[PDB]
Structure 1
Amino acid sequence: MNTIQQLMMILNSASDQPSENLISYFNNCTVNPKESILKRVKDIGYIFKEKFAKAVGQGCVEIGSQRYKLGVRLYYRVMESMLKSEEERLSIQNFSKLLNDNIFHMSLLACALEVVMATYSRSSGTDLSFPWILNVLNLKAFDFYKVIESFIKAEGNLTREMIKHLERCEHRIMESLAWLSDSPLFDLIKQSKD
């Protein structure tokens, strides 16, 4: 019963930086992640615009920036929702391990960017259709998937169409992508077969 309009208003005014509360969580960690988190956002954004422009026909594409930023605003809003949630579920305030994991932040961000770019599909060479974002970030399908269900429970403002799109990406990971030879899954299966 959600409309595209509300999430659009939320992201439009949301901040590009971690909130006071999110930093609160960064400072509660055995190892402080605020540093790697900011730097990662800086570099990926640099890589993302160049790639976007390249995939999009050719030249200079002022639209790549506007999207990445919306991605980041969602990324942070979702990370803080997940943390608040975990805190009331396990009653601990640390989380150092989760928040220092490169893959976790890599997956959250991608997922968040996949949603933002989805809404603006009706906006050559080829662009974003779901798998694209993976290659752009050098992120495996099996890792992305690990972030999907939580992302859906952390963001109460997702449309029906957006959850639907997220599920379709998940089904494609499960049907083949997570089974490619480059997939961490086979190690996860071997590690378990012993």
Structure 2
Amino acid sequence: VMNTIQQLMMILNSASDQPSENLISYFNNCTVNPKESILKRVKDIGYIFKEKFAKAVGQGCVEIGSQRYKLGVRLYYRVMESMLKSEEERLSIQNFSKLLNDNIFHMSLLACALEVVMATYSRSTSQNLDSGTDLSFPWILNVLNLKAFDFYKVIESFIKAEGNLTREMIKHLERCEHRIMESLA
């Protein structure tokens, strides 16, 4: 008895698939409104992710792959919002058109959100379960085709932005960081 779920996954499980009203407010406050492109990338990548998940995972776990993608997308919106708030407090600016219309910030942020979920192995990569396959780093970088160094650029702030991140998840992301470092020089 006694739930083993941890806080962030708990929050995530009950989160919504769409960006919050508060988040949409940040979109509407931009010189060039990022909504359309942001929703398109999420949807376009949702497909690459699912076909890749299937190709690495195998027969009918499609349900799994979809939920894994959903959880990552939710953390992504949760963290974007979170960074926006802290940046507005830091700069006293509320129009983040450049940041939000930037593909890399988005690809980077989404990869990291999906990385934390994929490393969490939500229900848990096991010796039998569906997605008992380990799909942690550099998996995501390859599925989104994202530069290791770009991915690296979002880590620190993703961690600063996500307080409900477990210590094991923080050490994971710091590990990916270390690895990308040694892959640099």
Fold conserved between structures, TM > 0.5: yes
Distance 1:2 1:94, change over 3 A: farther
1:61 Cα shift? Answer: 3.2
Distance 1:93 1:124, change over 3 A: closer
Q: Is the 8 A contact 2:111 2:141 kept in 1?
A: yes
Distance in 1 between the 2:87 and 2:35 partners? 19
1:118 Cα shift? Answer: 0.8
1:58 Cα shift? Answer: 4.5
Distance 1:59 1:146, change over 3 A: same
**Deviation digits for residues 108-157 of structure 1, max 9, x if unmatched?**
00000000011117769964131011111111101001100000011110
1:59 Cα shift? Answer: 5.4
Q: Is the 8 A contact 1:56 1:127 kept in 2?
A: no
Q: Is the 8 A contact 1:67 1:117 kept in 2?
A: yes
Distance in 2 between the 1:44 and 1:128 partners? 16
Question: Within the alignment, does 1:136 sit opposite 2:137 as a pair?
Answer: no
TM-score scaled to structure 1, two decimals?
0.85
Q: Is the 8 A contact 2:107 2:146 kept in 1?
A: yes
Aligned twin of 2:44: 43
1:32 Cα shift? Answer: 0.5
- The total of aligned residue pairs comes to 178
Distance 1:43 1:159, change over 3 A: same
Distance in 2 between the 1:72 and 1:121 partners? 14
Distance 1:177 1:63, change over 3 A: farther
Distance 1:55 1:163, change over 3 A: same
Distance 1:46 1:177, change over 3 A: farther
* Structure showing the higher helix proportion among its residues: 1
1:35 Cα shift? Answer: 0.5
3-state SS of paired residue (1:121): coil
What are structure 1's unaligned runs of at least 5 residues?
179-194
1:57 Cα shift? Answer: 3.6
Aligned twin of 1:19: 20
Question: RMSD between aligned alpha carbons?
Answer: 2.6
Deviates more, 1:5-14 or 1:98-107: 5-14
Q: Is the 8 A contact 1:110 1:133 kept in 2?
A: yes
**Deviation digits for residues 138-190 of structure 1, max 9, x if unmatched?**
11101001100000011110111000000000001111158xxxxxxxxxxxx
Distance 1:9 1:129, change over 3 A: closer
Distance 1:66 1:87, change over 3 A: same
Identity of aligned residues (%): 99
**Deviation digits for residues 97-118 of structure 1, max 9, x if unmatched?**
0000001100000000000011
Distance 1:76 1:124, change over 3 A: closer
**Deviation digits for residues 68-124 of structure 1, max 9, x if unmatched?**
000011000000000000000010111110000001100000000000011117769
